[PDB]
Amino acid sequence: QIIQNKLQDLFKADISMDKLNLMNLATEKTFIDLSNESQIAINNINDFLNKSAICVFDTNIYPKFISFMEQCINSVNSNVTAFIQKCTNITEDEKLQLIKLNTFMNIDFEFFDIQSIKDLITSETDLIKEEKESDYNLFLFTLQEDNNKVIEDISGKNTLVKYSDSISLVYGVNGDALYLKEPDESVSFSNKAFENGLTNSFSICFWLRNLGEIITSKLIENKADNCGWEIYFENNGLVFSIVDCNGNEENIYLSDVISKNWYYISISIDRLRNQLLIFINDKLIANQSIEQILNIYSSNTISLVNENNPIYIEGLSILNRSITSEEVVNNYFSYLNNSYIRDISGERLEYNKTYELYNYVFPENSLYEVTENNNIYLSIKDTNNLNIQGAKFKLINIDANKQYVQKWDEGVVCLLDEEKYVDISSENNRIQLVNSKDTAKRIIFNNDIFMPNCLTFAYNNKYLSLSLRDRNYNWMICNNNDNIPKAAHLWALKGI
Amino acid sequence: PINYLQAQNTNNEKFSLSSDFVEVVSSKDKSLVYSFLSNVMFYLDSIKDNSPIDTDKKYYLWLREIFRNYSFDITATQEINTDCGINKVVTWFGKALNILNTSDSFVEEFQNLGPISLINKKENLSMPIIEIYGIPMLGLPLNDLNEK
Amino acid sequence: PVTINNFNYNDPIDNNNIIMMEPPFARGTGRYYKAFKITDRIWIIPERYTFGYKPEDFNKSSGIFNRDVCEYYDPDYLNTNDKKNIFLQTMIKLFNRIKSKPLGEKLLEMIINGIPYLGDRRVPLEEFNTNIASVTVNKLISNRKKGIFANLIIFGPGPVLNENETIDIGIQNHFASREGFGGIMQMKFCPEYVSVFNNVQENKGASIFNRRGYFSDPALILMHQLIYVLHGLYGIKVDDLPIVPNEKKFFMQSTDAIQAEELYTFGGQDPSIITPSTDKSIYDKVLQNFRGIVDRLNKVLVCISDPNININIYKNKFKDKYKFVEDSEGKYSIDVESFDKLYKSLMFGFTETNIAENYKIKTRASYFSDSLPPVKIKNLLDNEIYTIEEGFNISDKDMEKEYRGQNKAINKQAYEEISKEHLAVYKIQMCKICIDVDNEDLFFIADKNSFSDDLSKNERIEYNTQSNYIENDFPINELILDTDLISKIELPSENTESLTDFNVDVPVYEKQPAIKKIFTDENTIFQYLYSQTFPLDIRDISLTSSFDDALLFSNKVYSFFSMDYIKTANKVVEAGLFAGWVKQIVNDFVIEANKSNTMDKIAISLIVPYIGLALNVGNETAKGNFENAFEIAGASILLEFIPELLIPVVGAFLLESYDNKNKIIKTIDNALTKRNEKWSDMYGLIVAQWLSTVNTQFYTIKEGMYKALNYQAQALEEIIKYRYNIYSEKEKSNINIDFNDINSKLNEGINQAIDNINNFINGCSVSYLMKKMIPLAVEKLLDFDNTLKKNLLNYIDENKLYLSAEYEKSKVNKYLKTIMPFDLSIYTNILNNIILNLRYKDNNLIDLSGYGAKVEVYDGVELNDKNQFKLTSSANSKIRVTQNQNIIFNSVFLDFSVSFWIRIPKYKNDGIQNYIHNEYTIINCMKNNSGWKISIRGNRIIWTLIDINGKTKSVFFEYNIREDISEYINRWFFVTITNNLNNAKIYINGKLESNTDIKDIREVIANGEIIFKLDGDIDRTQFIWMKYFSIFNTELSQSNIEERYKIQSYSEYLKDFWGNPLMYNKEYYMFNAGNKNSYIKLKKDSPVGEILTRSKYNQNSKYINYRDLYIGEKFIIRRKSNSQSINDDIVRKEDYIYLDFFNLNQEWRVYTYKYFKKEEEKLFLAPISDSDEFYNTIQIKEYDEQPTYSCQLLFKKDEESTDEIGLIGIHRKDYFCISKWYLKEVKRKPYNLKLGCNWQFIPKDEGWTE
């Protein structure tokens, strides 16, 4: 009512009609937000007083029940003992054992169970509310099926999804992902809550992979004429621009976003804190204050375009609240925990593909063949030799039907003229290259959860790593000593 | 508590928030309404006697501040350690529905006292009539007596 | 490559290793010293460093040498030959420990191979000269002098034992080590005396032995000084704009200027104090020095100082030292990539932080961290205290956890305190009475003159201008992997002609008064801290809530807690309620701490209110409500002195105009990259200012809060002791109180409060940086952006003839329309409260807690690789755990938790009475009929505590036995029992289950001997499975328990009904979570499994109810491609397999049709066969994020095909089918655990009968 009084008293002012409709829409959105805050307070007090009632039962009624039943159990035991002593058809030791066996300690009549009372005052209405409670304004879900792809919102808010038939479905990270290869494509998501407003917190969260190469191409737009927000490529990175209906702008350039690499973009706008957070992968990139940003009322349709750029978009999600750094990190690391070994590009690693080898310690030196003492190994390139081409690798599995590598997979590394294969010499505990497939070593491929695009080769519970410097060489060796750092046995395979 | 609940309601359209219940109920003009929103009242007193709002930016700022203060005020909770775990006590629960509203803070009185002090009718238990009949003395062997 | 020799101080002089050498600071005035060649080009002279020091200054006096160190003097030290020999032995041991690891070996290799250049600024560019005091040093042969080459000489301590230093040689105020040449360096280092620090900035929970002070590792200090030496030898010790502290105010700390090289050497957050402009300045200075060096190296042709010295060998050695590029013609050039790598590895590669992390040695958090008075190591040559490999933290002695080997309160048998009568500190006396405060306890606010303003300088933009950006970091792994341990050191012979010149600048050191008197009348942090102390002579003291009252008198001690706490502490009770009063007052003290209120109006999660009342720092924060003032005035009221921020106005860009047409496009891009670089430099400058001026004040506030809490704890302990001693002998004999327990509880409360304070203060500091520093720099950068946009627009207009300039204008506008976000991570860098942690290592159970508890496991206990052990009824099935006498739970306040996973078998149907009435203890910790035990009666798990008197308290958990399918009857579940001063709680699977009040328990003593053994009335077949047993010495919270249960429930494989790992080629019974009372049975005619209702138990007892699980078809799981390891046979998530079932005497697979119309399609149960119209591969997956025993089965076209068919389930007459509708419903954020797709496998277990 106070807000309505102020708005109606401000209607008698030198403000244009369009701005007045903007005020009315913003006030309606603020009323919805106030209702949401009131509901939050209501369930807060509900939980508080329910826990208070359970506590009062625990600390005010249960002791009285215990006292009363102790008094009763005294008489019960006395009567049982009297009855067992009146009988005279049994022995003495047997009678003592029987009377000791039929006794009533306190634990006999102790039935308190906090979980059994919490689950006893929760009704089917509470379960319905819990099931229908979702923190998502849009949770896009794609399902290839059999020759009939379906893209739809499964958040329960029923956003209207309009997409052309030129889009495809691939397997990007975890599940199917939209693939826009045909130029000038568009996917529109329509929902009332997407209109934003003066006071409402939200967050966009998706996976992006650009196959292009460097002009400014629009990626995601919600700009109604002037006001709104948008994300678009620029130079060699992204730009997130938010503009309100008063001229205030906020353009943030997120660098180090190059093509042929997966990126987990998470943008959060929290208007209770006047905070704008922008995470790329598992690292906070931007932390800005948007106190100068005001009503951003925009259209009810979020548009995803391609603009002559083949793009993979996965798990596009819009929430109705702000996200924290811990939650973003948890989502990013759990989304990649899917038993698939990835390459340095972020895509799935596959057998029978030309791959370049990199060590985690040296993210730019590619292993190259070295011949010495009539033996061929592979080693890091020296600092004086950086133009030497790296070695071409392939992974061979026992079954040729398998195409994608997985956790705990036995395989053989093949080097691309004589078709060399990896072997381990039990003279220097290094590796070498042989010309016999039967002489190769079946090594196990794995990866660490917190290093997703890196993998490890194991051979009887012994990781292969890089040795120390040796006259401008660093051979792969099967280490057993701890003097080599634990991060030196992480490798990366790059699609070459 | 019903008196406070009624006092938080007005039929007029030109009221003003007040933290004094006695002043609200003793107001002859009936222009004061009781409220526990300390943040909102403080903000409105701060902006009192200032430049009247005429521009759209000023109104947007005022609305945003009002919403932020209301959200901070209605969602105020303090986590205390109770015998059954952790309880998020609502801080303003003392002001509205006058209960343990003597002095200091509601959470301080709630912690020092128990949860029983919230309700106004305690010690309503009554022992139910208990009929535990004793065991009925015919002779029996060990197994039959054990089973009985 | 590096060898360490063994010497003795009485070894005869052989003039090859043990020689008589005149140091360069002797100026050829005789006084030869006995020196030992420990390693190549490194010499040890075990004599006091008397150069530049008057012999009268070696004693303690009213003077002082430095104003930042508690100086300890001992003239009698190093006075005999035995002391020299033990010093030599200690240095040998330290060098062995340094070389023990690859990083130290690489450091020593760089030091040895970094031989100084032969010549200085006073040497012609075309010739060498070895007649310089900084290159060659004289030795005596006659019992005839010669000259030798040296790189480092290690002397003994100077007047101050605990003040190590490294000095270079300067000639006419022209040091060779600051100009790229390099020279010998002299070290003052005493290994017996080490500095002591603290870790207030590090949070380790509510530990007892935390933040108690740590003594540094002598090897670490030696390696720090060796990093200094390495900087000196390579000639990179240049001098740039230093950090000059501001001392205008009285509370400011006054000290000598800090050069950037020291901060670079310290590492961590310290190099961020040096702004990027100064970083670039130092980089280009070193680059110019190396350019001069390479010009000198190319210009030389012959040597005139000593013709016996080879030219080509030395040129090659210097090329290897400086990492130069040898051209085919013969000239030597500089590769910038190589030089950049070498510079980054020398400055940011070898740091104290990186070395300490690599050697697992604790060190100071920051260069500006407070320093405690030093201590003396009792004996550094004892391998039972300090060893070469492990160092102070000996793993065998249970001292390698949390650097327990360096803890002052833990390793009390390895150090000795220094008497205050021999320590001099530069104290400041604050007189109105007068208060003496050490200079180390003052705010270190840097002056505005220490930060450069190179941003305001104009920059010339050309077509080849490269945006240079130095990075204050170098990966330590790259340094380690570049270490060579095989190739030997090939150094030229050190012998040469004797030294001729003796020009050298010996510094002169003069003491200064150690007391500075100042006059002020401001009650600030120092006065409030003083008011909380009492003299040792006072024995009857009382706490007062008035600061002035406690400041005036000596028997009144200030306090900043609630008046209720003061009233309780001042209360005097009878001897019959003394122990209860002590418990109450300690609990009230702890509750007074940890007082935090959550914050939601600031981007700061918690606020502690008792900071203004404790320190009164800033704008008189003690007055009024601290929380209200903080909310109203922001996060600036806590700042003692608001500093002026130096924000330069960025200069314009002078763009070169070319014609060009080809070079006129690259200049625009170069200007844009330079603008980005200017943005980054401005951000770095602001960050440096924040780290120097604002963060130090908050660190001082943190230290003051810690000291105030320590003073409060000491006052409370003194009051307790006085009250206990004021009683009669009979009353004192009647009361049993342990002072160790109250001290431990007070320390734990202090550490928890310090954790909260640390979080709050860090939040406030970061909030101040973002909301008071960054916006102004952003505004200035936006003004610069507008200016640059206008300049570029008028440049395009003024050169529009050459170069579609509309595209360039659009690109320029788009690029500068966006701003560069500010990142702080750029400039920055298990509950761990366990006391027992049983784990499986190799066919045995050991303790990974790090406290070294002896675990004896007998032959009756069955083990496995999954950390599960089964205790049976045999007399030899017992585990004995003996804990350390120092690591046990508190015996008075009783705050500890016990967590594990347990598995109990089903009751015996015929033995219900015996199963119910019998109660048998399974874990015991009783010594004298007191302690705690875990017992298992029928259907209950009881946790019991019995104190010394005899009063008992139990809390249990009973799982329903009448349920159809129970979740606890024979499956693993998590049990956690927590105990504090008031309640005992038991949680099952995270959720709280039961709670009892234990407020009437007097005192529980700890047996220290835990017995895992089923003792009591048990049947011959009675086994219990246990896993992941752990004990914590703190009361775990609900969220902590839930997180622990979630973490311990994660696994790579899948789980069957009982929780055991899913295994291939095993008999299973299918179970549906959605339809609990149903199972599948093969139809006699149709090839579709029919759904049948499960049986139940109605044999003889109505008290027991369940449903049979061994009914239905026996399912088996087989591999699809046999591509994994044969040794591994567990089923992992997202695995393609074949799901067969045993029908009669054959195995039949389950298939599905390729094409179907309805969503719910029936399965096809047929013998193993190959068909082109059916799908056979089933992918087993797990969809529930929360821990569960239910898995999902999906049908896929192929292992390499993205096509997906559906999910196996049961749909309503019930029908076992596959559905495509489950696919949409399985991805909903709130997972539905009652779905029809949730399947579990029940193998035949020995715990489940019928």
Side-chain angles (χ1 to χ4, degrees), chain B residues 24-27 31-40:
Chain B
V24 160
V25 302
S26 300
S27 152
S31 46
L32 311 180
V33 54
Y34 181 77
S35 164
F36 55 78
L37 304 182
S38 313
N39 277 275
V40 185

Side-chain angles (χ1 to χ4, degrees), chain C residues 74-75 77-78 81 83-89:
Chain C
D74 191 25
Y77 182 63
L78 265 177
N81 270 38
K83 298 177 172 170
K84 270 135 185 180
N85 190 70
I86 70 136
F87 175 94
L88 177 63
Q89 291 320 300

Side-chain angles (χ1 to χ4, degrees), chain C residues 72-75 77-78 81 83-104 106-108 110-120 123-125 127-130 132-139 141-142 147-164 166-171 174-178:
Chain C
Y72 169 75
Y73 300 93
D74 191 25
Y77 182 63
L78 265 177
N81 270 38
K83 298 177 172 170
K84 270 135 185 180
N85 190 70
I86 70 136
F87 175 94
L88 177 63
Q89 291 320 300
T90 304
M91 200 82 16
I92 293 290
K93 181 175 221 173
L94 291 193
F95 266 79
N96 273 294
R97 165 176 190 42
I98 286 177
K99 84 163 260 281
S100 94
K101 270 209 171 52
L103 204 58
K106 175 130 195 98
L107 173 67
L108 294 181
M110 295 267 162
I111 280 186
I112 279 155
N113 289 317
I115 42 165
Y117 182 72
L118 310 156
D120 312 317
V123 158
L125 286 93
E127 72 202 42
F128 283 161
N129 186 12
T130 80
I132 324 176
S134 77
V135 167
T136 311
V137 166
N138 275 330
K139 85 199 244 202
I141 306 142
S142 54
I148 67 196
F149 288 130
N151 292 8
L152 160 74
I153 317 165
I154 317 184
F155 289 96
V160 193
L161 302 193
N162 65 296
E163 189 157 65
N164 319 299
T166 307
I167 330 289
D168 44 25
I169 289 79
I171 296 168
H174 261 256
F175 301 84
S177 68
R178 319 196 176 174

Side-chain angles (χ1 to χ4, degrees), chain A residues 209 258-259 261 341-350 353-359 362-363 365-367 390-395 453-455 457 491-495:
Chain A
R209 179 171 167 106
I258 57 58
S259 96
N261 263 101
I341 281 180
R342 285 157 289 280
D343 68 342
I344 205 181
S345 178
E347 241 172 38
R348 266 188 307 170
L349 194 86
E350 45 210 355
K353 190 173 181 185
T354 285
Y355 274 130
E356 260 169 316
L357 190 41
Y358 290 80
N359 194 273
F362 303 92
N365 289 337
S366 309
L367 298 208
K392 292 337 181 306
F393 298 83
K394 268 201 214 297
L395 291 178
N453 308 346
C454 287
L455 72 148
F457 314 104
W491 309 83
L493 277 291
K494 159 184 274 303

Side-chain angles (χ1 to χ4, degrees), chain B residues 87 89-101 106-107 109-111 113-122 124-126 128-130 134 136 139 141:
Chain B
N87 204 2
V89 186
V90 157
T91 65
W92 55 260
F93 187 79
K95 270 106 91 184
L97 323 175
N98 154 78
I99 277 160
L100 312 186
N101 210 29
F106 170 76
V107 189
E109 280 215 60
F110 183 83
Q111 182 67 299
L113 279 170
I116 183 67
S117 48
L118 287 179
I119 66 196
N120 79 318
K121 297 204 93 67
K122 334 167 173 64
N124 324 284
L125 273 206
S126 47
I129 292 169
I130 299 292

